[PDB]
């Protein structure tokens, strides 16, 4: 259920030590890359510090050398505390709004405000409800509830009886009367009144009575970004915009006033600022109009740390015509700090394929693993990592248990690696449409 095995469902953190920053070679999924993972550990430990601006670290390297892997490791090694925001750099070129403002919203989404305030809630099974609607109305009524320990009677206001017939609280429900507002979230049904429920399904879950006292205070901790507050303070009822994207050009005085009130909340001790992480995946897909704004959005106090990944070598910059390293302008490459990765040695290829095999729970003979490492030496990680999933199913065709050489050699036979596909294009020129000609036999 919504945990289908993706291409990065085996990474459970960055995997490095947190005491001497040593990249131990096989832990939490990330296996083999040493120097880049130590530099990512240093960057990760200066994100959680908070006493640095929005800086820019560029994960440069060849294709399929573990850059999104390092980014997903840093995403998993923070939890749901410091806001990590992914950004493939083609979500910016929108039509609902401009392009620089679409970039500004992605900067504002990664600066959380974390505030902690209390509520007063009530657990418990309702023993019975009596409502004096006799022509009468919702005027007075009695509510007898209990936990395993407590038991109590309350009298109800009119704007609570109008909330009891709103949720239809029965005799046996497990409700949570939030006292400061009045909403009722029925946590379930009590088991002991299983006879007393007729208009339910045949298969219906039942809980037990809540344990402990019946009137307790919760210290809930909320964390919302500055883009949240910007979209909330933009219309009459405007938070729906951040669930439907219908926000437009937000005027800059609203963002300036919210940048003032967050500082006034911090100095009064009512709030706390958490700088997040913004991962601009495929940063070479930005034109120079983006870099002339990222060069100045990484200057203010309220700026998240930007981590970004580039594949291209000496390539052209979009918008302009002149080439540059990594597809980035040089006045912006002065800002960034570059981590270079390396291709993988064959034993590291073998154990990455071993981790990808143990993630999908596919049994492999060591001869088939040697053949698969031999394929991955010549066709990359993605092809062999797909041959695993293909070979399990081909072994399941003929009712086998373990995959072998006779199934990896079928998966290598049917599904071409891209080198043989380029050879197929080069040796089938006259029928494939190059630019002009179609020849039919």
């Amino acid at each position: 259920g919504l945990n289908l095995i993706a291409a990065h469902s085996h990474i459970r953190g960055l995997g490095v030590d947190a005491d001497t920053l040593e990249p131990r070679p096989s832990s939490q999924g990330l296996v083999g890359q040493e120097k880049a993972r130590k530099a990512a550990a240093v960057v990760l430990e200066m994100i959680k510090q908070g006493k640095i601006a929005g800086r820019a670290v560029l994960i440069a390297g060849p294709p399929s050398t573990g850059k999104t892997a390092i980014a997903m490791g840093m995403a998993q090694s923070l939890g749901q505390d410091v806001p990590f925001t992914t950004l493939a750099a083609s979500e910016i070129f929108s039509l609902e709004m401009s392009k620089t403002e679409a970039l500004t919203q992605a900067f504002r989404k990664s600066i959380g405000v974390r505030i902690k305030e209390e509520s007063e809630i009530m657990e418990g099974e309702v023993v019975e409800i009596q409502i004096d609607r006799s022509t009468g109305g919702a005027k007075q009524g009695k509510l007898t509830i209990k936990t395993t320990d407590m038991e109590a009677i309350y009298d109800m206001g009119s704007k609570m009886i109008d909330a009891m017939t709103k949720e239809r609280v029965m005799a046996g429900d497990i409700i949570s009367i939030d006292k400061s507002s009045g909403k009722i979230t029925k946590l379930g049904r009590s088991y002991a009144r299983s006879r007393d429920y007729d208009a339910m399904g045949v298969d219906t879950k039942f809980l037990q009575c809540p344990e402990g006292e019946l009137q307790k205070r919760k210290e809930v901790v909320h964390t919302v970004s500055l883009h949240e507050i910007d979209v909330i303070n933009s219309r009459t009822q405007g938070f729906l915009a951040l669930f439907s994207g219908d926000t437009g050009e937000i005027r800059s005085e609203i963002r300036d006033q919210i940048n003032t009130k967050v500082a006034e909340w911090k100095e009064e001790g009512k709030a706390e600022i958490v700088p997040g992480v913004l991962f601009i995946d495929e940063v070479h897909m930005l034109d120079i109009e983006c870099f002339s704004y990222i060069n100045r959005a990484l200057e203010s106090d309220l700026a998240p740390i930007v981590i970004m990944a580039s594949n291209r070598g000496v390539s052209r910059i979009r918008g302009t015509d002149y080439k540059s390293p990594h597809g980035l302008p040089l006045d912006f490459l002065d800002r960034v700090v570059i981590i270079n990765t390396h291709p993988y040695t064959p034993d590291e290829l073998r154990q990455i394929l071993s981790i990808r095999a143990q993630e999908e729970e596919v049994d492999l003979t060591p001869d088939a693993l040697a053949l698969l490492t031999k394929i991955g030496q010549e066709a990359g990680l993605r092809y062999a990592s797909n041959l695993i999933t293909t070979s399990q199913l081909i072994a399941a065709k003929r009712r086998a248990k373990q995959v072998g050489v006779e199934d990896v050699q079928r998966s290598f036979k049917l599904f071409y690696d891209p080198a043989r596909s380029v050879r197929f294009v080069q040796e089938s020129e006259k029928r494939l449409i190059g630019n002009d000609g179609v020849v039919d036999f």
Partner: protein, 59 residues
Amino acid sequence: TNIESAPSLAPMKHYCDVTGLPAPYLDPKTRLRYHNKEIFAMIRNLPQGMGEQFLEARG
């Protein structure tokens, strides 16, 4: 003469009658305001003839 005593009509803050701490909820069996589950335990296992004396001290 001697009928100048006057009652009140206002919401009263109801306290506990076992201890003196502020208590927000009562009982169906004995109708005693009580603070927490220790006082609820001592209410539900007290010897008979005293659960009326708490209401007698309260009124």
